[PDB]
Assembly symmetry: C5
Homo-oligomer: 103 residues x 5
C-alpha cells in the first residue's frame, strides 16, 4: 500500500483489464515462487506480430528469478474477496492462472 | 473503507461496469437466496469457449458456502446514495440484482 | 467528503460520462428540492426494448421524496468551478439539467 | 488541492481526454486574463445534433468574467511537468491552446 | 508523491495508455541523453490535421535541455514492479524506451 508500488500495480490491473477487453496480448515476468504465479512485470502490446516481448522487457526479467511469457491472450479477469482466495487473477486462453501482485 | 479489499471491491465495480457497458458476460460466486444477493467473486470473460467459468473460478466457489453463477449478462448499473439504499447494484438481463460489496 | 458516499458519487460520474459518450440512457432518482434537480440515484441501462427502469431502482426511489425520471438521453456533461455553478451537471436532450451530488 | 473542486478539475481532465479520444466537440468557459486562457468550465457535447451549448452552460458563464467558447474540437491533450510549464493543456484543430485549472 | 506533479504524471500514464490501445501517436519532450529516456512532457494527438507537435508544445520544449520527439507511435506499455526496474514505461515502434516520471 506504499508509494511507489501502489501506482505500478495499479497500472497492472489497468493493463490486466485492458488486455481482457481489447484482446491485446501481454508479456509477463511471473514468479514461480507461488501458485498461481504472481505477475511481477506486464507488457501490453499493440503491434509486433510473432515478435512479442520487447528487448527492454526481456532484459529486466532474465536478471530475475522470475520466468517470462510472451504473446499471451488474456480472456478472463478475476477478483475474489473470499480470504482463502483473496486477490486479483488473470487467466489465459490456454487456461493458465496468474495472481496480480498487491502493493 | 480499508486496504486491500478497497482493491478487489473497486475491481469488482470496474469489472461489473465493463460488463454492463461492453456486453461481455460475468461469472459470479454469489449469495443465492437473498435480495439483493452479494457477489463474493466475479470474473469478466470474453472469448472462453473452453469453459463458461474458468476452472480456477469454479474450484474456488467449491471452497465456499456461496454458489457459482456463470454466463450472466448484466444490463444495468446502479449507484445509489439515499439513506438505507446506499451502495452499488448491478442487474442482469433477466432481473437478478446483486450488491457490489464495499470495503 | 467521506466514504462510502465518495465511492458512490464517483460512480455516479462514471455513469454520467458513460451515458453521454455511448448514447445509453439512464434513470434518475431526482430531487426537485433544488434547482437544477440534484441526482440521488442513477441506473445505467444497456438492456433492450425498454420496458424501463429496473424494479429495484423504482422501489428505492418511491421510498423517497425524490421523483423518478426514466429513459432520459443524456447529451451534455459539464464540469464547472465558477463560484456559483460549483459542481457537476448532466444535460438531457430535452433541456433538463441535473446536478451530480458530491460526498 | 482540496475538496470538492479537485473533483471538477478532475472531470475536466477526464472530459478533456474524452473529447480528444472522441472528437465530440466541447463548450468552454475560459478566462483570457491568462494565456493559455484557463479553463473554468467545459461542456462535453454528444448528440448535440448540429452543435450548440446548453442554455444552462451559457447562463453560468455570462454571469462570470470568463468568456464562452462554443462548438470547439479538441485534438491534442498535453501533460507537462517542465518547471516553467507545469500544467495540463488541450489544443484544438484551430491551433488554440487552453490551460486546465489544477486542484 | 506530492501535489501537483502526481496529477500530471498520472495524466502522463493515461495519455501513454490511451495511445497504446488506440494507435494514436504522441509527441514527447523528454531528456536527451538517457537510457531509458525519461518523459518530461507528452502530448496525445488524434491527428494529423497538421502532422506533428503543436506550436504550443514545441515552444515549451525548445526552452529546456530536452529533446522534442514528434509522432512517436507507442507499442508496449510496461508496468514494472521490478527491484532494479521499478516504475512505468512505454516503448515506441523503433524500440525506443521511455521512463514515465513519477511523483
Amino acid at each position: 500500500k506504499d508509494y511507489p508500488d501502489n501506482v505500478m500495480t495499479a497500472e497492472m490491473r489497468k493493463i490486466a483489464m485492458a488486455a481482457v477487453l481489447s484482446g491485446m496480448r501481454v508479456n509477463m515476468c511471473a514468479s514461480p515462487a507461488s501458485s498461481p504465479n504472481v505477475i511481477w512485470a506486464i507488457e501490453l502490446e499493440a503491434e509486433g506480430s510473432g515478435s512479442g516481448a520487447s528487448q527492454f522487457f526481456k532484459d529486466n526479467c532474465n536478471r530475475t528469478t522470475a520466468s517470462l511469457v510472451e504473446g499471451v491472450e488474456l480472456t478472463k479477469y478475476i477478483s475474489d474477496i473470499n480470504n482463502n482466495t483473496d486477490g486479483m487473477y488473470v487467466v489465459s486462453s490456454t487456461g493458465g492462472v496468474w495472481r496480480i501482485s498487491r502493493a
